[model samples]
Target: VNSFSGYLKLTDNVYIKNADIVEEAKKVKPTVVVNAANVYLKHGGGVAGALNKATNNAMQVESDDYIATNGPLKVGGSCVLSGHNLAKHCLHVVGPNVNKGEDIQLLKSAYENFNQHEVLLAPLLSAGIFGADPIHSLRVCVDTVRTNVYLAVFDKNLYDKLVSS
Candidate 1:
């Protein structure tokens, strides 16, 4: 299902389904699985939590190793980790945990800083427990892609709302 939100082309190739993300993961088998994580690479809630469980909690361990060498993951930046049971690699983006409007900029910055990959899959950053508005964050995400993109809407209601709009 595809539709435009402003000048952005929400092409048919961009999926807007609200089905299980893990199911989508199986189908895409993306080369890079992007997670909206915290500074400490915590994966206790939202999409991160699901990715953690799917990857058998390997992300956090690898993230911790990286942190030990470097430092706390910066907001609007990311680090790559060896993927476990999911994709070939995991791109962990440290999303903002702040107020709504400010969070949008941070989320977009994170998306913009994203590394290129043949196949990349990312959750709607800062839109869940992070507390940013979903629709706004969705737009920023689409805007930041700067390449052909696909959106797999994991929330049932958000999918319906976007399609209807």
Candidate 2:
């Protein structure tokens, strides 16, 4: 998006993209994907919608079970969850909801929480309904890892702006 191309490479393993997260995650089975999840791990929209719908709602069922046993996830905490028809596993990390007073501190922690994993299809956490600034979110996401990741932004123009700035 940033470059005139469909990709932005952060490192050998990391990348930022203009691809579909669900399709790419499935295509690269066994490779883990990250879910920009909520406290409840609900798969209703955004990254959740893609994974939930593509996996025929199996993702949600698995997420619900995790929540049932582990309780609601705190913002910035991560949990490894099954992917069913998608990938081998997906690490769900709750992003900060600035709309509800949650802010960058936790959002940064969210990315750091998942930093151990290799580059994969990960979304810019909290830049969606959680109401964080897209540019800053992109900045934090890249800078935190700065250094293997693949980003999926639905709108190409937005991706360009976010990734570029």
Candidate 3:
């Protein structure tokens, strides 16, 4: 029946949920889950920080080793790293923190550069400490989503309202 309690479909291949994507991704078993990564790959705060602490810093160590091996990923850059968690891999992409033209370009490429996994589980980028507009981010996400992507948000009622908009 292709069912998950809170999953809402916006298109044939795109779905949205009002939940923490990291926890939900565990249930869906995506090929790769996304982390709106800091270019240095640190799980500094917000969703990224939550993931690091939830996993007891294991993911952060992987992030550390990765950055050490290959320098920082530039704005709009992406990389995949293996994990021993519920999701086998994590696709870490960097998005811009502002809503400027350059930030738009940077943010768009953050999603566009993603070419991973048949089923991807991710979050809305740039709407947190990064400060990009949520609606704008949503459009970029839909336009550039390359595979079956499940995007999770923070509020249930608000998500329904946004979908209805």
Candidate 4:
């Protein structure tokens, strides 16, 4: 997200709200609340926990049918099968990009949802899914994910590098 303080004047063709602090300070009053655009790449922890609950509930709901033994992706056949018509299995890849505040809470929620409760099909919110412009919240996800399941790609270039590697 980008922040703009005032209207772009006809005479002043300058695109306001540069990353530079000096440029930002000049445009707005001292009382103006300067908010930095925090680009979050994944779902919030609350959403993650809720989804985990939903998945677990789904598993319980489908216990009587063949769907009980398989995940939703397998039951629903969501993704298109490419080469050999492999039945698409929906996997909840956990990757969260949150602000600097309350990252640990998300981690705890994810842990409780999966580990403590043995939630086999929990919608996870692993912190540190790289953002379009990842500045601060990089280490949280990298350091704390329970499994090495999801791929963290900040951009296409990074993803290509990971693929090549």
Candidate 5:
């Protein structure tokens, strides 16, 4: 998702820079969102490939460590929607390559829907999927509701509460 010169002033925007809207909007968005991750496959060229290789290796290890320790709280997909679970319900949103009308709408939608009172754990951003694409997920989160936004990832060595237990 790529936006251009004017940045999105409001939060909750989601857009993709590449692909044709005619077919992609109808197909790609749905298919890609679930497994959407580090777009290394998109990067080519010899130099970038080498650097990506090193960066990718370290990224993979970090991803694995997160998975190994935190359970499945971070792994995300499109169909999951809003629901309760033993962990966080990862929201797999498209990254914004540039700002657009649709992106602003989506961001507002997420902001309207997000619950500040709901337990939110951290290091939470659309990382691999939307890395460096200017996602306003957190800022919208702040604007969403009046409740005190707690940060469990801060000084406390606490874990998110489970709905089941």
Candidate 6:
């Protein structure tokens, strides 16, 4: 069941629902919004593209410098502190490009490095562009983290389905 804000409480610390991730970021003012990006933080589609647009294209421009200097992120690695406009910070994680049987492990590894104080807002990691299952991704995100996890669900019925199943 969702609150008036479209946040469905999954646990005391985890919430999920369908809404625009950017709008959630603005309203909640999380310390960072994690982007499921490629190794270079390229913003072509899915969460990366949406975040890039939300930050007024500032995310990609800043991430480009970080990637160039620090090098491309590995599948489970991350680049941090990128974002502008509505977001205070952005975390870019390189999720698996191909959905192997190892999607959960990869997504978990990405979330593991997140800052503890950050009220982290994330999409279903690796579900889009990477072709992983959204349900599995949500489970991984919830199970692997110790901090607050707010997931952006594109499908409104996703929460009920995850609960029922």
- Using lDDT as the measure, the top candidate is 3
Per-residue CA lDDT of candidate 3, range 104-148, in tens?
Answer: 678888987665567777888777778787788888888887677
> Candidate 6 overall Cα lDDT vs. reference?
0.73
Worst 10 residues of 5 by lDDT: 155-164
| lDDT for each residue of candidate 4 in 1-165, tens digit (9 for 90 to 100) | 123443222121212111222232233212221111112112133432232233443422332232344433211111111111111122223222344333434443332222221111111233233221222222333344343222222244533433343
- lDDT-sorted candidate list, best first: 3, 2, 6, 1, 5, 4
- Among residues 3 or more apart in sequence or in different chains, the pairs in candidate 4 whose N, CA or C atoms overlap within 3 Å are 127-141
Off by over 4 Å in 5: 1-78, 81-89, 94-102, 122-138, 145-165
Where does candidate 4 stray beyond 4 Å? 1-104, 111-138, 152-154, 157-165
- Estimate candidate 4's alpha-carbon lDDT, on a 0 to 1 scale: 0.26
Comparison by TM-score, 1 against 5, better one: 1
TM-score of 2: 0.88
- Point to the candidate with the largest TM-score: 3
Evaluated at residue 106, the lDDT of candidate 2 is: 87
lDDT of 2 by residue, 1-165 (tens): 112235676556457777777766655663577888999988888888888888888888888888889899988888987767766678888889999898668878888876777545678889888899888887777667632677778778887776566
| Candidate 2 lowest-lDDT run of ten | 1-10
lDDT of 6 at 52: 85
- By TM-score, the better pick of 1 and 2 is 2
Give candidate 6 regions above 4 Å deviation: 1-4, 100-104, 157-160
lDDT of 6 at 39: 81
Better of 2 and 5 by TM-score: 2
TM-score of each: 0.83, 0.88, 0.89, 0.23, 0.27, 0.86
lDDT of 5 by residue, 42-71 (tens): 223222222224344443444345446654
lDDT of each: 0.68, 0.76, 0.78, 0.26, 0.28, 0.73
RMSD (CA, Å), each prediction: 4.8, 3.8, 2.5, 19.1, 17.5, 3.2
